[PDB]
Design a protein around this ligand. Structure first.
Ligand SMILES: Nc1ncnc2c1ncn2[C@@H]1O[C@@H]2COP(=O)(O)OP(=O)(O)OC[C@H]3O[C@@H](O[C@@H]1[C@@H]2O)[C@H](O)[C@@H]3O
Ligand SMILES: Nc1ncnc2c1ncn2[C@@H]1O[C@@H]2COP(=O)(O)OP(=O)(O)OC[C@H]3O[C@@H](O[C@@H]1[C@@H]2O)[C@H](O)[C@@H]3O
Lengths: 125, 125
């Protein structure tokens, strides 16, 4: 099945984000589609992109390799840094960037804690 | 051309994220690759995914449609929400999720400000 995400942005959205499939390992969904909101005059949706996540903890049998959430945030972190070094910097970009980095820091704190407890990549609290 | 991002996570990374090509509109890069740190039985990457961004402000001549940064953050917001409803919820996930959402709110504050000033989709401060 598929459900569209309710996004924080409400107006002038370029793309919609769709959640594909059912809940899987960790309680998470593992496939998302980014799709143009509007069509051109020939009916084409210029953007139609699928992102598939790592599905199951990496050391567990039958897990499948994929993207991980920090990868996406690192890309947006780099984009925001570029925008701030470019001709159209803004305070909003500055604040978004700090929050994206703080998210990444919390995700990495989780990783390093799981390394310390020797549970990274396993289905263990 | 290609450059590996320096990520907040330093250890046990699933994937490497790379920036492809040169700086373009807005001072930003517009192509990123996510590739696994693991190889399959034939020495090919288990994961090799490419993200291409909206390139040029949307109303300018020759701009190209693509992913936008808030789409990626919305996917991560949904994943963290799922993790927090699932069997392996954690305090780090909750703090990460609030920061992702606050980043999305700042990004939307920028959008709505540019709408009010009638500059959204144009190369103007
Ligand atoms: N913030 C988070 N990031 C990643 N996983 C998280 C998480 N919060 C909870 N989980 C779940 O907690 C267990 C071990 O987690 P991790 O040890 O970090 O596993 P990892 O090898 O990186 O695989 C990650 C993959 O495992 C599955 O969910 C995991 C897995 O059930 C799911 O498919 C995910 O894509
Ligand atoms: N947080 C941010 N998000 C998007 N753009 C940002 C930004 N900070 C600065 N900019 C740049 O500032 C100008 C007007 O910006 P936006 O009006 O928001 O334009 P948008 O139509 O959404 O296209 C976006 C595309 O325009 C190009 O960069 C823009 C563009 O030079 C670039 O290729 C980007 O992918």
């Amino acid at each position: 099945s598929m459900k569209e995400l309710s996004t924080i942005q409400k107006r002038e959205k370029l793309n919609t984000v769709e959640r594909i499939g059912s809940e899987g390992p960790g309680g998470a969904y593992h496939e998302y589609v980014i799709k143009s909101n509007s069509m051109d005059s020939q009916g084409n949706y210029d953007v139609y992109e699928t992102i598939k996540f790592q599905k199951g903890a990496r050391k567990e049998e039958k897990s499948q390799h994929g993207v991980i959430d920090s990868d996406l945030l690192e890309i947006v972190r780099d984009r925001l840094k570029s925008f701030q070094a470019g001709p159209f910097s803004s305070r909003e970009n500055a604040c978004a960037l700090t929050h994206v980095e703080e998210a990444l820091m919390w995700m990495n704190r989780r990783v390093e804690d799981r390394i310390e407890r020797n549970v990274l990549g396993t289905n263990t609290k």
